[PDB]
Amino acid sequence: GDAAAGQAKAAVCAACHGADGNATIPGYPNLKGQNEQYIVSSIKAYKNKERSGGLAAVMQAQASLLSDDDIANLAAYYSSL
Numbered sequence: 001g002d003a004a005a006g007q008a009k010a011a012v013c014a015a016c017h018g019a020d021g022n023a024t025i026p027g028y029p030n031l032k033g034q035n036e037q038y039i040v041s042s043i044k045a046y047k048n049k050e051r052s053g054g055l056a057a058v059m060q061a062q063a064s065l066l067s068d069d070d071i072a073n074l075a076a077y078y079s080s081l
């Protein structure tokens, strides 16, 4: 994945995950520096609705907007922070 392409795509994500990938809403997760493969698999889990219920509903919607390339790029960006 291409971290610069990920940075471009992350504008929408920053409202909930923070400009720097540290979230500031209680209950919302930090992404900054998270394992790259884990970020991939976790966004794919939401896209496949293998995570459900509660705040997952929200990420299901977000994940459905992302192509497999976008997910790779986002993971490269966040893991690099």
Ligand code: HEC
Binding pocket: 009, 010, 012, 013, 014, 015, 016, 017, 027, 028, 029, 030, 031, 039, 042, 043, 051, 055, 056, 058, 059, 062, 066, 074
């Ligand atoms: C609120 C309007 C959000 C937007 C926009 C984005 N995300 Fe999100 N994300 C949000 C919540 C509340 C949660 C927790 C959901 C849960 O199952 O409890 C998440 C979770 C993630 C994760 C998983 C993190 C983990 O540690 O397993 C990822 C990788 C993630 N979110 C990524 C992400 C991306 C890349 C976004 C822009 C396309 C994005 N989210 C937007 C809230 C919100």
